[PDB]
Ligand binder design. Structure first.
Ligand code: 6V8
Ligand code: CL
Length: 262
């Protein structure tokens, strides 16, 4: 059966023409509210969180790792390189690459993080090490965004991603300095104003990471601090039937508004 929350989410899904996945964790009582919570969705750029977190984990035993310069060559540039293009024939540190990937969704920066982990499988291995049995990263940017219906590549479920995002930011999957750094990065994201943030009260602090891809795939994952109550974690994934469907960040904002009502 379904609650009124899930009925509202289903009606939003129906009106939108696509497939919506939602997972909310309320850390006050560890309850979850799910909509298609165990179905797989293409993560697209929301996978940048796991890649950055994996490098943070590496830095727990190599304290200066984040400050290590990494060469940016002309040939490294892919389809969206707002920060990395400023450093061609130059360098960016792993911290700078992490900030660029998370806060600007720079795809060259993401590919450097993936390479630092030994390839997409290294990101997946980190996920398994922190108890995420669902996440899989198969490809680099930009092909991880093909988002073909039914394809398990580069997917996770809303429930799994919400649980992991909680572990990474409010829990202790990462060390102290590292989890605080991840929170700082997520809070300063520049690309999320029309997504989850647009559906929540303005007094709430939010850290988030968006993503987008083919099939009009439009995603956001967030850690949320309401004023005067325990924080929440929210995942909103959305994908559509036709390859060239338009982005629908408004659907994510609407899903967040629905979840926040209660
Ligand atoms: B992320 O969602 O992975 C990222 C964020 C944007 C802001 C750069 N998305 C993409 O790169 C989307 N890319 C595609 O849909 C794409 C691009 C290219 Cl060049 C080739 C294949 C695909 Cl699927
Ligand atoms: Cl994005």
């Amino acid at each position: 059966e379904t609650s009124a929350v899930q009925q509202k989410l289903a009606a939003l899904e129906k009106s939108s023409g696509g497939r919506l996945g939602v997972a909310l964790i309320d850390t006050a009582d560890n309850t979850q509210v799910l909509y298609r919570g165990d179905e797989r969705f293409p993560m697209c750029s929301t996978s940048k969180v796991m890649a950055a977190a994996a490098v943070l984990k590496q830095s727990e035993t190599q304290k200066q790792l984040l400050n290590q310069p990494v060469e940016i060559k002309p040939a490294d540039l892919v389809n969206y390189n707002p920060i990395a293009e400023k450093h061609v024939n130059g360098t960016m540190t792993l911290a700078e690459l992490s900030a660029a990937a998370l806060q600007y969704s720079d795809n060259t920066a993401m590919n450097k993080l993936i390479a630092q982990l030994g390839g997409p499988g290294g990101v997946t291995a980190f996920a398994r090490a922190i108890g995420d049995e669902t996440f899989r990263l198969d490809r680099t940017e930009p092909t991880l965004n093909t988002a073909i219906p039914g394809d398990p590549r580069d997917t996770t479920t809303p429930r799994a991603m919400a649980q992991t995002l909680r572990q990474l930011t409010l829990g202790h999957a990462l060390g102290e300095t590292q989890r605080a750094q991840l929170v700082t990065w997520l809070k300063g994201n520049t690309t999320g104003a029309a997504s989850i943030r647009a559906g929540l009260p303005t007094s709430w602090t939010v850290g988030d990471k968006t993503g987008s891809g083919d099939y009009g795939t439009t995603n956001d994952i967030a850690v949320i601090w309401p004023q005067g109550r325990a924080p929440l974690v929210l995942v909103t994934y959305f994908t559509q039937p036709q390859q060239n469907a338009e982005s629908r960040r408004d659907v994510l904002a609407s899903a967040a508004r629905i979840i926040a009502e209660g």
